[PDB]
Design a protein around this nucleic acid. Structure first.
Lengths: 88, 100, 117, 55, 56
RNA sequence: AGGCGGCCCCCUGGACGAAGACUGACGCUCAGGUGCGAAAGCGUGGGGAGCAAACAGGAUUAGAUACCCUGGUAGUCCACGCCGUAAACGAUGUCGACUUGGAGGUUGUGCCCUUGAGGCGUGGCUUCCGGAGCUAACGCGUUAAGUCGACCGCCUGGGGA
């Protein structure tokens, strides 16, 4: 998944200093940082399906927060989905 | 940083390399910003049954405070090293150095 | 023949029969006899005194080597493995200790289904 | 138990034929008995507790 | 497994030890679990059936 | 949840024990919709100990396409999908509130000179006995089959099916 040092990276940049981890940017960036990792792990194997059941929750929970982000602040919201680079 | 328990035996026929062998690991953890927490040579030790041959054997154990790769890179030297038949890592739960 | 004074009686005591084998230290079997190869057929093959008589027939033709000691091999439940050893007692043998020889599978082959009789 | 290197006390958990004695007779914590097997089957290749006396 | 011969000891005294030695598991009794083919559903309920029998 | 037990690393994930901040209703339910999904089998590339359908042989029987005995194909083990069904049961929808008891276990955790494996609280789960209550009874019975709040699901004689 992601390391504690690499988890510490996402909170600060997408949050208000290093202390805003409840910011959805932390999770989604953490989640965005994670879908690609398992994407790497899932890029190999292709046999880690049940962990891919861990894979979807990231993608779906990623959809949830961004769509959650849309209602609260689009000016902020538009920042991350481009910042997280999904949707066309 | 994770702490790990590293225990590996040098065959009694290989008893001399232990001084040469461990120092390389000493440079192996010292390199990765981690250090040693306990390094004891228990000496040669009897084993009840042969591992496809021979009884008794020489034991060496050392605890580490180093990253996974130096943990992982170190586990590489052991597989290739036929002198070091087995070392398997256990636990972190903070580092300790005690007992006998 | 050849004088050994230290043999080995491998007792295989089947549910139907109790077969014991005499052998030397390297395992090179010297002699061997069966409870069912000693009279008893069908039901009577797997009886203790049937295993006892097997020891009588197994206990002979193995001292012709002049065996003076022989380590023993336990094997499984059933009529033998107790009467065979008793008959071996009749000759005036010595035995220090008896150690279990059971291969304990650690979850190996799929088990057997009970005989739907 | 805790470690595979102390086969001396590990031996009380083995019958004379190398089959690991049930911890139920030996007692020991439920988790502790597991550590015995970890030190025994895999560490076999380290020759900790004998198979049996055949050879 | 070595079953050794001492000096002066009759084969009768160990006679008790002979069956006690392997009765602890039972060579043929555990052989009873490779003679035929059994579904694992049998043992699990074998554990289940035996588990129930084990409640005094 | 099915389902999960020889040993070690990555990662996960969920879960509960003590205080301190954080925001403030941001909650529960869900048609449709979305994922997973015990066992067998099959498709496809391997593997291949046990074996054991089908199927061969020997026995009983009046007869025994079986039970009894020797074989035995598939398959059972590593890789991709499908199939998505079963006594998948505690025959016990989901979430929140109230309520005699009794007696254990295990798992946090303070307390107490542990003055000793103990004594005294604070949570979780769970094991057995049972007040009330209620039930057609059977019994359940503070994890309610006793007392309330929301959503969803479902049945209308037997066979046909």
């Amino acid at each position: 998944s992601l390391s504690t040092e690499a988890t510490a990276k996402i909170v600060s940049e997408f949050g208000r200093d290093a202390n805003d981890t409840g910011s959805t940017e932390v999770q989604v960036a953490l989640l965005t940082a994670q879908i690609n990792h398992l994407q790497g792990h899932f890029a190999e194997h292709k046999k880690d399906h049940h962990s891919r059941r861990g894979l979807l929750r990231m993608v779906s929970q990623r959809r949830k927060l961004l769509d959650y982000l849309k209602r609260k602040d689009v000016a902020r919201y538009t920042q991350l989905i481009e910042r997280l680079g999904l949707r066309r | 940083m994770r702490h790990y328990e590293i225990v590996f035996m040098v065959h009694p026929d290989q008893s001399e390399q232990v001084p040469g062998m461990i120092e390389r690991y000493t440079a192996a953890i010292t390199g990765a910003e981690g250090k040693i927490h306990r390094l004891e040579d228990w000496g040669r030790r009897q084993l009840a049954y042969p591992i496809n041959k021979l009884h008794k054997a020489h034991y060496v154990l050392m605890n580490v405070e180093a990253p996974q790769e130096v943990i992982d890179e170190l586990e590489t030297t052991f597989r290739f090293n036929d002198a070091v038949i087995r070392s398997m890592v256990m636990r972190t739960k903070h580092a300790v150095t005690e007992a006998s | 023949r050849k004088q050994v004074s230290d043999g080995v009686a491998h007792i295989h005591a089947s549910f139907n029969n109790t077969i014991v084998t005499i052998t030397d230290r390297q395992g090179n079997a010297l002699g061997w006899a069966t409870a069912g190869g000693s009279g008893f057929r069908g039901s009577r093959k797997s009886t203790p005194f049937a295993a006892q008589v097997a020891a009588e027939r197994c206990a002979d033709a193995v001292k012709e080597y002049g065996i003076k000691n022989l380590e023993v091999m336990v094997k499984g439940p059933g009529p033998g493995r107790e009467s065979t050893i008793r008959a071996l007692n009749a000759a005036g043998f010595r035995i220090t200790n008896i150690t279990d020889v059971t291969p304990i599978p650690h979850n190996g082959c799929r088990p057997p289904k009970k005989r739907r009789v | 138990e805790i470690d595979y290197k102390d086969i001396a006390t590990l031996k009380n958990y083995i019958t004379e034929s190398g089959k690991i004695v049930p911890s139920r007779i030996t007692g020991t914590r439920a988790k502790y008995q597991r550590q015995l097997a970890r030190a025994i089957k895999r560490a076999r290749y380290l020759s900790l507790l004998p198979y049996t006396d055949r050879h | 497994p070595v079953i050794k011969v001492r000096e002066n000891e009759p084969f009768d005294v160990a006679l008790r030890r002979f069956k006690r030695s392997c009765e602890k598991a039972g060579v043929l009794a555990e052989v009873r679990r490779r003679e035929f083919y059994e579904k694992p559903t049998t043992e699990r309920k074998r554990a289940k059936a035996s588990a129930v029998k084990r409640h005094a």
